[PDB]
Paper text:
Breakdown is then initiated with the conversion of the C‐3 hydroxyl group to a ketone (cholest‐4‐en‐3‐one, cholestenone) by the oxidase ChoD, and further oxidation at the C‐26 “tail” region via a three‐step process involving oxidation to the hydroxyl, aldehyde, and carboxylic acid species. These sidechain‐modifying reactions are catalysed by the cytochromes P450 CYP125A1 and CYP142A1 (CYP125 and CYP142 hereafter). Comparison of the effect of complementing a CYP125 knockout in the CDC1551 strain of Mtb (which does not express the CYP142 protein), with CYP125 or CYP142 reveals that the two enzymes are functionally redundant with respect to growth on cholesterol. Here we present a series of compounds based on an ethyl 5‐(pyridin‐4‐yl)‐1H‐indole‐2‐carboxylate pharmacophore which bind strongly to both Mtb cholesterol oxidases CYP125 and CYP142.
Examination of the overlap of the co‐crystal structures for compounds 1–3 in CYP125 show that the incorporation of a five membered ring onto the phenyl ring offers a vector for further elaboration. This led to the development of compound 4, where the pyridyl ring is fused onto the 5‐position of an indole ring. The indole ring has an ethoxycarbonyl group in the 2‐position and, along with the NH of the indole, provide vectors for further elaboration. The affinity (KD) of compound 4 was shown to be 3.0 μM (CYP125) and 0.75 μM (CYP142), an improvement in affinity in comparison to the original fragment hits. Gratifyingly, the CYP125 binding mode is preserved when these fragments are merged and modified to develop compound 4. Although compound 4 is similarly effective in bridging the hydrophobic active site regions in both CYP125 and CYP142, the observed pose is notably different. In CYP125, compound 4 extends perpendicular above the heme and the indole occupies a small pocket formed by Val267, Glu271, Trp414, and Leu415 which is not utilized by cholestenone (PDB code: 2X5 W). In both CYP125 and CYP142 the indole nitrogen in compound 4 forms solvent‐mediated polar interactions. In CYP125 this involves a water molecule coordinated between the carboxyl oxygen of Met200, and the sidechain of Glu271, and for CYP142, the interaction occurs with an acetate ion derived from the crystallisation solution. Combining information from the binding position of compound 4 in both CYP125 and CYP142 suggested that elaboration of the compound from the indole nitrogen offered opportunities to exploit the space above Trp414 and Leu415 (CYP125), or the pocket surrounded by Ile65, Asp77, and Leu72 (CYP142) to further improve affinity.
Residue numbers in the entry:
A (entry chain B): 19 to 247, 250 to 427
B (entry chain C): 19 to 427
C (entry chain A): 17 to 427
C-alpha cells in the first residue's frame, strides 16, 4: 500500500487549486504504479462506481491509449471529474464531440477533420501569428508589468483558433468571450458563469458561418470541412467541431505558456540558453513540464490485464499524464527542465493512438512564436508574486501571475 | 536515500508560499527520518555551513529540545531561514531576546518573565478578551462576507498582547502597526517594510512605559517586571524593551494562523465543526494547534558531537526541528491525518518540544483560540469559504495572508 | 602570368579529393604560379557557401598576415570551417558562432581572457604525469594485441583523456564524453553518415551545464572552477558559455591530435632513419615536425570586412579567404627542404596551430605534450612496429583525417 493519507483522491479539485501533487505521484510510481483510487459515495465527481485505477507510468498510459478497442472514451467520456452532483445527461453530452467517441464514428470524423490540421493549414497561420505574437509581447513590455496570463498567454492561442477558422476580426471579441466562458467552471472565480449558454452561442455562430460559407465557398478550412471530397461534416457536426476546437485550443496552450515561463523564471540558466539559441525542442519540454491536461480517463470494455493488474469490464482507468511525464524510467533527470531534451517522448499531448492531439503542431508553433517574442521584447522579465492556480480535477491551470517585464 | 527531487530544501520559502510539503515530510519519516538537507552556496537562508539535519520524528524533536545543554539556541538562533543575503550581525541581534539565549542567561529571564504568563495572570484577561472576541465575531457576521484573516483572526491576538501590557487604548493603533511591521517580510506583499526600524519604535515605546511605571507603579505586569522582586531580580530597562519586542512579535502571527487554519480545518471537516458548536470541548484548542502548526520549524546548533537515533551530529552543525512533520508522526498518533477535536492525549509539539524553551504563551494562545471559536460558533455557525486561502512566503512560518469566507452561509 | 596547371573546376575544399589523397602537387603549383588564386565554385557546390568561390591562400607569410589582421579578416561573418555538406542550412552555419573559434572581438576577447585560466602552463603541466602513465598503458595494451588498427589502439585515446583530465570529468562519464566528441566530425564520410552533430552538441551542452552547476558547489582543482568563478570585474563563463566551451574543446582537441599521431607514425614508417634517431634521442622537436607534416587542419577561412590588398591581390569586402595550412607548412621560402621529414627541425615556424594572432590555438602545448608522451610510449613498447596495409583517409573538405591504419606492433 502506497504511503498516502487515508481516502486520498488524485482527482480532488481542492488539491490542484493549491499545488500539483508531485510527491504523491512519485510515491505511486515507486510503490503502486497502478493503484485503486477509492471514492466515497457521492464523491466521485459525477461517477458512481466507487473509484478508478490511477495510471502513473508512461508505458501504461501509452498501452491504454493504443488499445482504444478495449479502453473506451465514449463509455464515460474522458474527463475524470465534474461537480459531484452533475447529472449523467450532462456527462453524456460530451459524446457529441470527436474526443468522446469510439470507432467507427470517431474514425470517420477524425478523417474529415484532418483537412484542417494539415501542414498547409497550420503553416499558413505562421506569418500572422508571428506578427500577432510580436505585437502582444511589445504591448506587454510597454505596460512594464501586469498579469502575464492575460497579457502574454491568453490571446495568441485564441488568435490561432480564429485564424484557422477564418473568423472575421469583428467577431473575434465575442468568439473569444464564449470560448473563455467555457473555462474554469469549477473554480469560484468563475462560479457565476453559465457555460451552457456560451456553448449554445458558439454552436449558433458556427452554423451561420457554415451556412454562409456553403453559399460562398472559399479556399479555407471551413469550406473544406463542409465540402465533400462524399464525406463531409454535417451542419451539426461542424458546430460541435467549433465548440471542441474553441475549448481544446484555448486553455491548454495558454497554460503551457504560463508554466513554461514559470519554468524559465525558476531555471534562469535555461532562459539564458533559450534567448541565445532559440531551440525548437523547447516547445516539447515546455509541454512536458506544463502538462496542461493532468489526466484523461478511459473505460474498460472487457477484462484486461495491465502490467499485472486485472482491470475489469466497466471499470475506469485515469491516465495521469502529470505523473507519466516525470517517469524516472523514461526520462533522464525528469525533474530537470532542459529545453534541449531530445528525443522527448512525453505524453502531454496524450499517448500515441487514435485520439492523439490533432492540434499538437499548432500548439508547438504558438508556443515557439510567443516565447521568441518574449525573448525579443522582454528578455529580463522576472516574476513579482506567486501564481494563482485553477481549481480543477483534471486541468492544470494558472489563472493569474504577476510579472515585471522590464526587470 | 529518500524519494525526493534533487536539490529539495525543506526551508525553501518558495514551497511554503504555495503549500505545506506534507507528502515530502512523510517520505522522510518513512525512509530517512534524520536526513542531511544540503544547501548550495548562497542559498542557506543566511547560513553558510553547507546545510542542516532535517528532524522529522516527534521523539527526535523532543530529545533535542530536552537536551538544550547540547543543542544550543544562541549559537545561530532558532529561525532556520532568512533572506539569503542577510548580514551575520542581523542574525546575531536575535540573541537579545529570550528565545535565542542559552543557560544561564536564559534561565534567569525565563524565571522573571514567566510570572506574567501563569494560569492566573492569563485568566485575568479572560473577560476582556471574551467580550472582544464576541464583538469581533458579531461585526464579521454583520459584514456578511470578507477576508477571515483580517476580520476574525488578526485582532484578538493583538488585543491579548495589549491587554497583558496595559497599553492605553489610544496607543494600541501604533502598537499593532509596529508589531505587524515585523511580519510577512519575506513575502512580496509586504516586501516594503523595515523590521529593524520598527523594532526601534517598539523599544522606544517600551522605554516610555518602563519610565512611566517607575514613576507611577501600578498593580499590572510592567510594574512587576521593572520592580525588584523578593530575590532582588528584575528586568533591566534594556531587557524590558526586548521583552516587549519578543511579546509584540511572538504573540501575533502564530495565534492568528492557528485561528485561520483551525477554521480551514473545520470547513474541510464539517462533522467536527458540528461537534464543536454543540460541545465546545476543551481538547479542541490543542488539536487546532497540532493541525495548524504555526511554527513550521525551529533550529538548534550542536555544541558537541552527539548521536541521535543512530545518526552522528557533529559539533557546529545545525539541526532543524520540523514540527509540521512531528505533529503528523504516524508512530505517535495512530491517525495523524484525522482532524479530531476530542483527541486526548495529544502530545503535539506545536508549542515546541518540552524543555527549557517551551512556549510560555501556550495557555494564553489556547484561551485566545477557545474564545474566538466560541464567538464564531455563536455568531456565524453556518459560515463557509468562498475561495482558497493565500499562503505566506516564508521558510519557517506557516502563514495564511488572506481567506475569503461567507459568514452568513 | 600563365594560369596554374590544375584540372578545370578543381576545388581545393572538395572532400572527394581528401578521401583519397592530399593535393600536394596542386598546392605546390599554386605556390609557384598563383600563390593567391580565385577558387571558383559552381552553383550549389560551395559546401554551404553560395558566393561563387573564395581566394586560396597558399603562402605562409600570407596566412600569417591574414591571421594577424583579425580586424579585417573575420571569423564570425561566415565561421572558419570552409566546407560542409552542400545542402547545409545557413542557420546551421550561424549557430556555430556560439563557440569562441567563430567569434570576433570584442566578444572573442572577453571569452579568450576567461578561457586562458584553463590553459595556463601550470594547468597543462599538472596533467603531465597522468597522461604519461596513460600513454604507457595505451602502448602496452596495443603491443599485447600484436597487431591492429593503430588509429584506434594508439592514436584515439590519449587526446580524449587530455580533454577529460583538463575538465576533471569523472571516469564513469568519460565513455559518453568520448562518444559525444567522436560524433562531432566526419559526417561527410560514408562511415559516419549516421552521426548527428546537432544532437551530440545538445547532449554535450546539457551535460556540461550540469557539471558547471555541480562544480560551483564543490570546487575542484580542474580548470572548471577557474572558468565559472567571477573575477574582480565579475567576468566568468555562464553555465551555457561553459557548455559551448566544452563543445569547442571536445571538437578542437580530439581528432586534430589523433591525426597528428597517426600521420606522425606514418611519416616515421616512411623515414626509418628518422625513427631510429627518434628512438635513440627522443627529441621533443619531433612533435612540431609531426604537426607540420600532419597539418591536421588543412584549412580555415576568414571573411573580409573591407577591401584589402594582400600581396598584390585586391580582396573585396565580403569575399572569403581560405588559409591552406597544408600548403603554407611546405612553403619553400620559409622552410629549408620542406619535403624532408626532419624531427630536429629548429626553429620550426609552422602554422599547423594557425598563424600567430587572436585565435592561435590555445591547446598547442597540450597537443605537443600529448604527442611527445605517446611517441615515447610507442618507442618504449613497440619500437619495431611496421604497417600492414595502406591508411584509409577521411572524406572531409577541411580536416586531414585517417580513419584506419593496420599495423603489426611486434614487427
Ligand atoms: C499544449 C497544448 C495542448 C495540449 C497539452 C493538448 C492535449 C491533448 C490531449 C491530452 C489530448 C487527448 C490525448 C488522448 O486522449 O489520446 C488531445 C486531443 C485533442 N486535441 Fe489537444 N492539446 C493541446 C492543444 C490543442 C490545440 C491547439 C487544439 C486545436 C487547435 C487541440 C485539439 C484537440 C482535439 C480536437 C483532440 C481530440 C482528438 C481526437 O479525439 O481524435 N489541442 N489534446
Ligand atoms: C498558537 C500560538 C503559538 C505557537 C504555535 C507558539 C509556538 C512556539 C514554539 C514552537 C516555541 C518553541 C521555541 C523553541 O523551542 O525554540 C515557542 C516559544 C516561545 N513562545 Fe510561543 N507560540 C504561540 C503563542 C505564543 C504567545 C501568545 C506568546 C506570548 C504572548 C508566545 C511567546 C513565546 C516565547 C517568549 C517563547 C520563548 C520561550 C523561551 O525561550 O523560554 N508564544 N513558541
Ligand atoms: C595537433 C593538434 C591541434 C591542431 C593541429 C590544432 C589546430 C588549431 C588551429 C589551426 C586553430 C585556429 C588558429 C587560428 O585560427 O589562428 C586552433 C584553435 C583552437 N584550438 Fe587547436 N589544435 C590542436 C589541438 C588542440 C587542443 C588539444 C586543444 C584543447 C584541448 C585545442 C583547442 C583550441 C581552441 C579552443 C581553439 C580556438 C582559439 C580561439 O579561437 O581563440 N586545440 N587549433
Ligand atoms: C463538458 C465539455 O467541456 C469541458 O468541460 C472541457 C472539455 C475540454 C477539453 C480540453 C482539451 C481536450 C483535448 N485537447 C486539449 C484540450 C480542454 C478543456 C476542456 N474543458
Ligand atoms: O522576524 C523575526 O525576527 C521573528 C521572530 C519571531 C518569533 C515568533 C514566535 C516565537 C515563539 N513563539 C511564538 C512566536 C513568531 C514570529 C517571529 N518573527
Ligand atoms: C544546442 C544548439 O545546437 C547546437 O549547438 C548545434 C551544433 C551544430 C552542429 C552542426 C554541424 C556541425 C558540423 N557539421 C555539420 C553540422 C549543425 C548544427 C548545430 N547546432
Ligand atoms: Cl556577514
Ligand atoms: Cl493522538
Ligand atoms: Cl548574420
Ligand atoms: Cl626549416
Amino acid at each position: 500500500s502506497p504511503n498516502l493519507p487515508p481516502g486520498f483522491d488524485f482527482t480532488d479539485p481542492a488539491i490542484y487549486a493549491e499545488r500539483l501533487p508531485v510527491a504523491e505521484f512519485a510515491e505511486l510510481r515507486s510503490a503502486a504504479p497502478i493503484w485503486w483510487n477509492g471514492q466515497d459515495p457521492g464523491k466521485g465527481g459525477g461517477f458512481h462506481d466507487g473509484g478508478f485505477w490511477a495510471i502513473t507510468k508512461l508505458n501504461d498510459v501509452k498501452e491504454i491509449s493504443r488499445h482504444s478497442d478495449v479502453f473506451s472514451s465514449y463509455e464515460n467520456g474522458v474527463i475524470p471529474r465534474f461537480k459531484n452532483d452533475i447529472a449523467r445527461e450532462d456527462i453524456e453530452v460530451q459524446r457529441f464531440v470527436m474526443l468522446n467517441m469510439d470507432a467507427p464514428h470517431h474514425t470517420r470524423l477524425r478523417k474529415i477533420i484532418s483537412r484542417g490540421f494539415t501542414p498547409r493549414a497550420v503553416g499558413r497561420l505562421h506569418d500572422e501569428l508571428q506578427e500577432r505574437a510580436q505585437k502582444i509581447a511589445a504591448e506587454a513590455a510597454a505596460a512594464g508589468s501586469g498579469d502575464f496570463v492575460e497579457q502574454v498567454s491568453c490571446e495568441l492561442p485564441l488568435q490561432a483558433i480564429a485564424g484557422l477558422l477564418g473568423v472575421p476580426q469583428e467577431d473575434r471579441g465575442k468568439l473569444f468571450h464564449w470560448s473563455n466562458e467555457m473555462t474554469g467552471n469549477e473554480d469560484p472565480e468563475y462560479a457565476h458563469i453559465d457555460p451552457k449558454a456560451s456553448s449554445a452561442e458558439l454552436i449558433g455562430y458556427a452554423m451561420k458561418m457554415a451556412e454562409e460559407k456553403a453559399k460562398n465557398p472559399a479556399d479555407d478550412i471551413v469550406t473544406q470541412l463542409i465540402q465533400a471530397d462524399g464525406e463531409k461534416l454535417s451542419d451539426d457536426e461542424f458546430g460541435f467541431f467549433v465548440v471542441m476546437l474553441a475549448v481544446a485550443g484555448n486553455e491548454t496552450t495558454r497554460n503551457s505558456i504560463t508554466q513554461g515561463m514559470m519554468a524559465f523564471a525558476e531555471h534562469p540558466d535555461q532562459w539564458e540558453l533559450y534567448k541565445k539559441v532559440r531551440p525548437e525542442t523547447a516547445a516539447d519540454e515546455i509541454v512536458r513540464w506544463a502538462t496542461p491536461v493532468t489526466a484523461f480517463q478511459r473505460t474498460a470494455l472487457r477484462d484486461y490485464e495491465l502490467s499485472g493488474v486485472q482491470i475489469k469490464k466497466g471499470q475506469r482507468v485515469v491516465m495521469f499524464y502529470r505523473s507519466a511525464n516525470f517517469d524516472e524510467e523514461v526520462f533522464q533527470d525528469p525533474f530537470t527542465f532542459n529545453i534541449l531534451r531530445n528525443p522527448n517522448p512525453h505524453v502531454g499531448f496524450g499517448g500515441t493512438g487514435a485520439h492523439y492531439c490533432i492540434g499538437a503542431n499548432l500548439a508547438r508553433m504558438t508556443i515557439n512564436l510567443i516565447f521568441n517574442a518574449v525573448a525579443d521584447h522582454m528578455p529580463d522579465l522576472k516574476p513579482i508574486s506567486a501564481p494563482e492556480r485553477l481549481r480543477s480535477g483534471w486541468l492544470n491551470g494558472i489563472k493569474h501571475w504577476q510579472v515585471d517585464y522590464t526587470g
